[PDB]
Scaffold this active site. Structure first.
Site, PDB file in Angstrom:
ATOM      1  N   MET A  38       0.814  -1.179   0.000  1.00  0.00           N
ATOM      2  CA  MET A  38       0.000   0.000   0.000  1.00  0.00           C
ATOM      3  C   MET A  38       0.873   1.264   0.000  1.00  0.00           C
ATOM      4  O   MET A  38       0.436   2.360   0.426  1.00  0.00           O
ATOM      5  CB  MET A  38      -0.969  -0.062   1.159  1.00  0.00           C
ATOM      6  N   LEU A  41       6.901   2.701   1.349  1.00  0.00           N
ATOM      7  CA  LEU A  41       7.730   1.545   1.422  1.00  0.00           C
ATOM      8  C   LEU A  41       8.813   1.746   2.471  1.00  0.00           C
ATOM      9  O   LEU A  41       9.363   2.856   2.609  1.00  0.00           O
ATOM     10  CB  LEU A  41       8.354   1.357   0.053  1.00  0.00           C
ATOM     11  N   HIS A  42       9.118   0.695   3.217  1.00  0.00           N
ATOM     12  CA  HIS A  42      10.209   0.759   4.148  1.00  0.00           C
ATOM     13  C   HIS A  42      11.002  -0.458   3.850  1.00  0.00           C
ATOM     14  O   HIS A  42      10.688  -1.195   2.896  1.00  0.00           O
ATOM     15  CB  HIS A  42       9.694   0.736   5.602  1.00  0.00           C
ATOM     16  N   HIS A  45       9.158  -3.833   3.148  1.00  0.00           N
ATOM     17  CA  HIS A  45       8.805  -4.054   1.747  1.00  0.00           C
ATOM     18  C   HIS A  45      10.039  -4.410   0.879  1.00  0.00           C
ATOM     19  O   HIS A  45       9.925  -5.250  -0.056  1.00  0.00           O
ATOM     20  CB  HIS A  45       8.156  -2.827   1.137  1.00  0.00           C
ATOM     21  N   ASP A  86       9.236   8.731  -3.373  1.00  0.00           N
ATOM     22  CA  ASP A  86      10.186   7.909  -2.645  1.00  0.00           C
ATOM     23  C   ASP A  86       9.922   6.403  -2.857  1.00  0.00           C
ATOM     24  O   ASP A  86      10.856   5.592  -2.795  1.00  0.00           O
ATOM     25  CB  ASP A  86      10.168   8.234  -1.155  1.00  0.00           C
ATOM     26  N   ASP A  87       8.659   6.032  -3.080  1.00  0.00           N
ATOM     27  CA  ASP A  87       8.338   4.639  -3.401  1.00  0.00           C
ATOM     28  C   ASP A  87       8.993   4.205  -4.729  1.00  0.00           C
ATOM     29  O   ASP A  87       9.746   3.215  -4.777  1.00  0.00           O
ATOM     30  CB  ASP A  87       6.834   4.399  -3.465  1.00  0.00           C
ATOM     31  N   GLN A  90      12.937   3.875  -4.653  1.00  0.00           N
ATOM     32  CA  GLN A  90      13.525   2.713  -4.018  1.00  0.00           C
ATOM     33  C   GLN A  90      13.412   1.478  -4.937  1.00  0.00           C
ATOM     34  O   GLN A  90      14.378   0.690  -5.041  1.00  0.00           O
ATOM     35  CB  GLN A  90      12.843   2.472  -2.686  1.00  0.00           C
ATOM     36  N   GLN A 162      -3.691 -11.290   8.694  1.00  0.00           N
ATOM     37  CA  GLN A 162      -3.838 -11.022   7.298  1.00  0.00           C
ATOM     38  C   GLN A 162      -3.216 -12.124   6.421  1.00  0.00           C
ATOM     39  O   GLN A 162      -3.878 -12.599   5.493  1.00  0.00           O
ATOM     40  CB  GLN A 162      -3.275  -9.629   6.954  1.00  0.00           C
ATOM     41  N   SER A 194       7.045  -0.712  10.283  1.00  0.00           N
ATOM     42  CA  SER A 194       5.689  -0.415   9.882  1.00  0.00           C
ATOM     43  C   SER A 194       5.609   1.007   9.348  1.00  0.00           C
ATOM     44  O   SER A 194       6.354   1.921   9.837  1.00  0.00           O
ATOM     45  CB  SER A 194       4.721  -0.560  11.067  1.00  0.00           C
ATOM     46  N   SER A 195       4.718   1.200   8.375  1.00  0.00           N
ATOM     47  CA  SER A 195       4.464   2.527   7.806  1.00  0.00           C
ATOM     48  C   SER A 195       4.013   3.481   8.907  1.00  0.00           C
ATOM     49  O   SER A 195       4.294   4.674   8.859  1.00  0.00           O
ATOM     50  CB  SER A 195       3.371   2.434   6.729  1.00  0.00           C
ATOM     51  N   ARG A 196       3.363   2.946   9.930  1.00  0.00           N
ATOM     52  CA  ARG A 196       2.806   3.802  10.968  1.00  0.00           C
ATOM     53  C   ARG A 196       3.719   4.130  12.162  1.00  0.00           C
ATOM     54  O   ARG A 196       3.301   4.905  13.052  1.00  0.00           O
ATOM     55  CB  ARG A 196       1.446   3.253  11.389  1.00  0.00           C
TER      56      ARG A 196
HETATM   57  C1  LIG Z   1       9.455  -8.120   5.782  1.00  0.00           C
HETATM   58  O1  LIG Z   1       9.207  -7.230   6.755  1.00  0.00           O
HETATM   59  C2  LIG Z   1       8.068  -6.551   6.744  1.00  0.00           C
HETATM   60  C3  LIG Z   1       7.689  -5.840   7.862  1.00  0.00           C
HETATM   61  C4  LIG Z   1       6.517  -5.136   7.885  1.00  0.00           C
HETATM   62  C5  LIG Z   1       5.704  -5.082   6.830  1.00  0.00           C
HETATM   63  C6  LIG Z   1       6.049  -5.718   5.718  1.00  0.00           C
HETATM   64  C7  LIG Z   1       7.181  -6.454   5.659  1.00  0.00           C
HETATM   65  C8  LIG Z   1       5.063  -5.465   4.843  1.00  0.00           C
HETATM   66  C9  LIG Z   1       4.135  -4.689   5.414  1.00  0.00           C
HETATM   67  C10 LIG Z   1       2.975  -4.248   4.858  1.00  0.00           C
HETATM   68  O2  LIG Z   1       2.495  -3.216   5.176  1.00  0.00           O
HETATM   69  N1  LIG Z   1       2.338  -5.047   4.036  1.00  0.00           N
HETATM   70  S1  LIG Z   1       0.854  -4.688   3.295  1.00  0.00           S
HETATM   71  O3  LIG Z   1      -0.193  -4.886   4.246  1.00  0.00           O
HETATM   72  O4  LIG Z   1       0.883  -3.378   2.774  1.00  0.00           O
HETATM   73  C11 LIG Z   1       0.623  -5.911   1.970  1.00  0.00           C
HETATM   74  C12 LIG Z   1      -0.635  -5.893   1.382  1.00  0.00           C
HETATM   75  C13 LIG Z   1      -0.921  -5.001   0.407  1.00  0.00           C
HETATM   76  C14 LIG Z   1      -2.128  -5.018  -0.232  1.00  0.00           C
HETATM   77  C15 LIG Z   1      -3.086  -5.909   0.191  1.00  0.00           C
HETATM   78  C16 LIG Z   1      -2.829  -6.812   1.165  1.00  0.00           C
HETATM   79  C17 LIG Z   1      -1.598  -6.790   1.759  1.00  0.00           C
HETATM   80  N2  LIG Z   1       4.558  -4.424   6.633  1.00  0.00           N
HETATM   81  C18 LIG Z   1       3.960  -3.740   7.706  1.00  0.00           C
HETATM   82  C19 LIG Z   1       3.664  -2.278   7.769  1.00  0.00           C
HETATM   83  O5  LIG Z   1       4.227  -1.511   7.010  1.00  0.00           O
HETATM   84  O6  LIG Z   1       2.954  -1.953   8.693  1.00  0.00           O
END
Ligand SMILES: COc1ccc2c(c1)cc(C(=O)NS(=O)(=O)Cc1ccccc1)n2CC(=O)O
Ligand SMILES: COc1ccc2c(c1)cc(C(=O)NS(=O)(=O)Cc1ccccc1)n2CC(=O)O
Ligand SMILES: COc1ccc2c(c1)cc(C(=O)NS(=O)(=O)Cc1ccccc1)n2CC(=O)O
Lengths: 288, 272
Positions: A38, A41-42, A45, A86-87, A90, A162, A194-196
């Site tokens: 979404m 990106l960090h 991702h 920035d997305d 990267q 999820q 996390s993005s947040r």
């Molecule tokens: C490998 O290490 C990580 C650590 C945290 C990650 C991730 C990977 C990926 C996410 C993330 O936000 N994934 S997402 O929910 O945006 C994927 C997604 C996108 C669209 C529909 C369903 C799921 N997040 C969590 C976040 O940003 O909150």
């Protein structure tokens, strides 16, 4: 079939474009990897991208779409972090060849009509106070999988509920894709990416370490059983300033309608001021 | 590794979803176009017209899926030149029971969705599954259950599925009675009255030069001339089952109870 330039970032907005390119690539031998995001990106991702890149002969597709369907709530959708410059920078730096950035009208031209209804897991934990949240996520994931038709799709384990519901989707609708879960990337103190995280002030960023400290405490305490593992995590969360705990729960790894055995997943959700943080870890109970 | 045995030009029967998935993929890769004809219950002549339509696509291989004499039906399919029958058990189709499902849009709550409110959820969830297992180029349904056909086109659009949905005009008895497994249970008086459904609709489609009201009243008149025919709805809609536009193309739908049997019919209408 629009232009595909190998060895650079091709950006498509139209679902028909990415679909034709993907099918074209698959027919010539390349395995298509999909990393749904979404945006914002960090390094988490980036780790999913790097896992997808290691698959021999892969072409990696990263989707960027802030999906209105999984959101509440008045202001949640508008507040989502958006940083698409920035997305794309990267992804270009990681060698990604395809970015799929659909508009909302192209994903939902008829509004909300046919939807995925998840199993009862979607009403528990994160889904308890947000009853349509996981139907929104499973609906967008299915559409992504159908547009892109990847061999494998990659998700982090941080949003473990999820990831589990996504596995159910794939199994229950006979989707022909391998779901790959990638262990959570963490800050050097243990804070899950996390993005947040950007919403924590310095004091909150300090306290936030409590969640991952609690989970790792529990994972080591667990030689002494479930009660001792949970009590360890709770003690660490209690010692932390203005961490407000929403739940701390130990479940079977599929989170399903079955009791905990030797292996489980410990999940925590907590609020620091206005920011809600989630984390989770694998737990082996007792003898292991 | 190994693809299950497939013998081209014969009837090959598979009960395992993974088997039919593998064979369909092998077929697509050697060139054939995969056509899917879903069926349920005992085979009737409507299902056979679906097969014949599918068989005429050049280079096609026809897959017929069957949900529950079984060997007589298989011998019919063999006689039609069908090369694959997919005959899964409920356990194979639902190995984890009922879990993730399809929720139809608001159309599923109207018309037939009034007496049977979750019937279309079941149908869309199983068609979605069959589509993912077989991955056909084209999938074939009768126009008879028109509300089902429209819901499946919405499914395919909304979930970005790759398949062409082919609706085949309804096979009818010589007096016009739309083909259905239920027709076998009508006693002579019910069978005779049941002609009113198709007679009403075709009267309506021809009265349509005089406008939408004339078309509806013509149908209602024919229905009112039959005894023992309790009409549940008689509705004029656009071809996607939204509100009928002032002119242009439409669909007229009827459902009625004759004794214990519910009968349905529909027809294309062109206003003015
Ligand atoms: C490998 O290490 C990580 C650590 C945290 C990650 C991730 C990977 C990926 C996410 C993330 O936000 N994934 S997402 O929910 O945006 C994927 C997604 C996108 C669209 C529909 C369903 C799921 N997040 C969590 C976040 O940003 O909150
Ligand atoms: C076990 O899985 C499969 C899958 C596809 C197969 C077969 C087996 C066998 C054929 C097939 O066409 N065999 S054939 O001798 O009639 C024609 C043929 C011969 C050599 C190369 C390709 C096709 N074909 C291609 C077909 O039936 O059109
Ligand atoms: C070309 O002319 C016709 C005429 C009537 C037809 C058909 C075709 C097909 C059917 C029919 O029974 N379709 S089905 O319920 O077996 C399709 C189906 C199969 C599996 C799951 C859901 C739907 N029927 C009868 C009916 O729809 O009740």
């Amino acid at each position: 079939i629009p232009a595909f330039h190998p060895g650079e970032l091709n950006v498509y907005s139209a679902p028909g474009d990415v679909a034709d390119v993907s099918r074209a690539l698959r027919l010539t031998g390349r395995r298509v990897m999909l990393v749904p995001t979404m945006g914002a990106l960090h390094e988490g991702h980036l780790a999913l991208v790097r896992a997808a890149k290691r698959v021999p002969g892969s072409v990696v597709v990263v989707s960027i779409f802030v999906n209105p369907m999984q959101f509440g709530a008045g202001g949640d959708l508008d507040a989502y972090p958006r940083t698409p410059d920035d997305d794309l920078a990267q992804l270009r730096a990681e060698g990604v060849e395809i970015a799929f950035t659909p508009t909302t009208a192209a994903m939902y031209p008829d509004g909300l009509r046919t939807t995925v209804q998840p199993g009862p897991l979607a009403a528990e934990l994160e889904g308890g106070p947000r009853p349509t949240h996981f139907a929104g996520v499973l609906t967008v994931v299915l559409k992504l999988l159908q547009i892109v038709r990847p061999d494998r799709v990659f998700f982090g384990e941080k949003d473990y509920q999820q990831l589990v519901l996504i596995r159910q989707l794939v199994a229950d609708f006979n989707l022909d894709v391998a779901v790959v879960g990638v262990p959570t990337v963490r800050e050097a103190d243990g804070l899950a990416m996390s993005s947040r995280n950007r919403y924590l002030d310095p004091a909150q960023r300090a306290a936030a370490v409590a969640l991952s400290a609690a989970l790792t405490a529990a994972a080591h305490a667990a030689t002494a059983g479930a009660q001792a593992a949970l009590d360890a995590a709770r003690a660490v969360l209690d010692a932390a300033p203005g961490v407000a705990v929403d739940y701390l729960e130990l479940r079977d790894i599929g989170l399903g309608p079955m009791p905990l055995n030797g292996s489980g997943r410990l999940l925590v959700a907590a609020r620091l001021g206005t920011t809600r943080l989630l984390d989770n870890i694998a737990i082996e109970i007792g003898t292991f």
